[PDB]
Amino acid sequence: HHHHHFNLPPGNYKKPKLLYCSNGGHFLRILPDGTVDGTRDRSDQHIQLQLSAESVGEVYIKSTETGQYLCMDTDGLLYGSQTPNEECLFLERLEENHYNTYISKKHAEKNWFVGLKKNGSCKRGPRTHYGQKAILFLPLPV
Incomplete structure (x- = not known):
């Protein structure tokens, strides 16, 4: 079933x-x-984000300030x-034995990742893939 590895951070x-992305140094x-x-x-x-598990390896990314959930559309x-x-x-x-990457479960087979461009704008699912700097996140304390 799995379309991806299972190395967990x-x-x-x-x-x-806080979800920091080295690509341009932004906080999602x-x-x-x-x-x-x-x-x-x-x-x-x-x-400030609060993550929570669903099945092992699965998470919800919720904004603590406004109760909102991160989602990726079709x-x-x-x-x-x-x-x-x-x-x-x-x-x-886990990615590169160090960073954290977030892949859209629904769109797992398309290799659609959460990512931030260098200018601070979000990446489009179709414009992301393994090996990009934009998909590498580091979970930091608030």
């Missing part, structure tokens, strides 16, 4: 985290209106949703 979901953010992107401002109140674009749906689950995996 060290860590827990006990506390929220889920704005109030549902907008998803990144920002370099560590003080931003919409970058075109590969990320957005914030009020409640969970059939497109808010992601496969949390």
Whole structure:
């Protein structure tokens, strides 16, 4: 069944985290209106994320500030949703024995990842793939 590996990162979901991406040095953010992107401002109140498990390897990425869920639509674009749906689950995996990568479960077979461009804007599912800097995240303490 699995279309991807199962190397899992060290860590827990006990506390929220910040999802930092080295590509351009941004923190993934889920704005109030549902907008998803990144920002370099560590003080931003919409970058604090609480992850939680579903099945092993699966996570929900929720904004602690606004209760919103990260989702990826059928075109590969990320957005914030009020409640969970059939497109808010992601496969949390280790990558390069160090970073964390988030793959859209629903679109696992397409190799669609959560990613941030160098300019701070989100990547489109179809424009991401293994080996990109934009898909590498480091979960940091708030």
